Design a protein around this ligand. Sequence first.
Ligand code: NI
Ligand code: NI
Ligand code: NI
Ligand code: NI
Ligand code: NI
Ligand code: NI
Lengths: 227, 227, 227
Amino acid sequence: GMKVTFLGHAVVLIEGKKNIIIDPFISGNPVCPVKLEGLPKIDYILVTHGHGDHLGDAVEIAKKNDATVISNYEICHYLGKKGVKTHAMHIGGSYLFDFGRVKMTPAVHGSGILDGDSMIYGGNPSGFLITIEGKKIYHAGDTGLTREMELLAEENVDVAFLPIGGNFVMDVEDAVRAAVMIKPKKVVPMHYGTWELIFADVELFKKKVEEKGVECVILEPGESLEL
Amino acid sequence: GMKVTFLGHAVVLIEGKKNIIIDPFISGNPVCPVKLEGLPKIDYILVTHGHGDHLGDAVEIAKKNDATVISNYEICHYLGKKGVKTHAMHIGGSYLFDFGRVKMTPAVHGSGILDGDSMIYGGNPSGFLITIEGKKIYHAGDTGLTREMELLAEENVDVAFLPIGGNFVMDVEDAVRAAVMIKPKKVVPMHYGTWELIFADVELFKKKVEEKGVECVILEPGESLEL
Amino acid sequence: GMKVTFLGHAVVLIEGKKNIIIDPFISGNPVCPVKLEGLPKIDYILVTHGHGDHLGDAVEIAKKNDATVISNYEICHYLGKKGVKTHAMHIGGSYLFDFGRVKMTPAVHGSGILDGDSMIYGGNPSGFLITIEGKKIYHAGDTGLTREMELLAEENVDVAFLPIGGNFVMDVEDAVRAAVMIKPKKVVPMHYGTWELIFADVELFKKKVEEKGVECVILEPGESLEL
Ligand code: NI
Ligand code: NI
Ligand code: NI
Ligand code: NI
Ligand code: NI
Ligand code: NI
């Protein structure tokens, strides 16, 4: 099987036959319970978009672990110049890796890479649909509500990670609509509570989304579930 | 109560408990009836995307009024470096300000910021759904027809500003389709006639859109309506 | 009438009253049967997005032929600084040229322009809907599956070029879903086989898409069809 750990914000660690981390915003993440040294051996890094609180410590983690970063073409070009190993994809594209299948999904957001003083173009933002041993995980990344999420309903997602913080992403209300579009077996709220600007009523989300027949698992940073 | 004035092209002004201007392309706008001096006290500035005919005089207006620019993260970064006060958001995110709620809506467009001879990355383009005193205003920004507009149907928008100029945006035919998808109480056409390249038959738009059951108010630049 | 020639990868040549080429990745394209010299007189060049394997030889072809490049505002700005004639548009915008109508369609992808070692921002990616003498050609460009494709169903497209290579774009299974959304009279697969990373079972695509009631025409690079 596999162990899926939420480490705060948009961060998600997947431990199976290979170890995969999504949007590794670790150092500088005020709600992340672990340091970089607290992570296990990392094989793959998934980056949804270029923003600092998602790209995060991908360069350091990749180099330390000899890990491969999976992201869009533009983000992978940026990382390639830093001496990071990459497997470039793009939106709606999928590839079968040794551990399983990764598919980039559409998102409505931005993908600017802040490099010192300059905003570098990091392609278009995404989510990830990950298929491991028949099980399906959806990490929406940063996104607003979008009708492209309806395309995921036929996938029969087991666990969906959705942002609920609002302002930069979907709020509670729109996240509930997203859950109804996607119809995952379980939903985990994320990308909230990190700062005051993205405070969200997570208990209200659980209540509202479970009224729509979708099980909601509120994971505190550090907590995990099994698939 | 509030007064909503179309200044022609993409330009819009909302006067209520606070004054809000959307896409302030004033100086250099051949169809704009006012100078910068003609504008009242501005509290907030909304920028849909980075193109010059929408970004416009955001910097000058912001500084002279001590106003806050509301836009996406990448645009707010660019403006921040020029000494402008900002409230960063992104696509599908909303925030409750003192005057009311602003929500960024997805749009199909570009968002290049022309600085000198360089094309700076300005995130992804957007529209704005503005909720003030129970009234809803939709400013589509620059956009082509998109299925995301159907998400606004349940909002029961009071006034929708849609581009009809074509070429850079929806033409008359697609704007009619957008109006039917959104089904607002009123539609106001915009972003046409400024140059010959974006000539549109605005009277034909009114006829066609009203045949589909959506009232069209053709506002000349300078003309307003009351909410 | 007109002759439509697939020249491998995303490349498509349309020969009629005027000569139009889409995404002219000629030199450095190992599956393209022709050299640049092998192209006829080119009147217009269509560029879906900034990636090198689509932008291709647009600059050189344009200069040699005194041709006009049709692409989004940001791409046309880049090309403009290299002394290329351009007609700028954007997503969902259309314009009536002497040969016929061109409309930019939404795509879910990126649009980075690689200039030396810098990733220049090239707007948002697109497809093209081209109307010539009542005939409609859809070139999807690089894209994942998107609900925006359903907007094209009412057009009754005659020929639709869809990528099936996977990884960077739709794979076989998603391209079939796209074909069903669009319901063209004919579908031609493309953007596969060029490298090992984008290998695709083109015969399986034909079989599966024709089961859904859409005729599939497999064109090897160099082959053509009449409209
Ligand atoms: Ni974020
Ligand atoms: Ni973000
Ligand atoms: Ni514009
Ligand atoms: Ni624009
Ligand atoms: Ni490509
Ligand atoms: Ni591409």
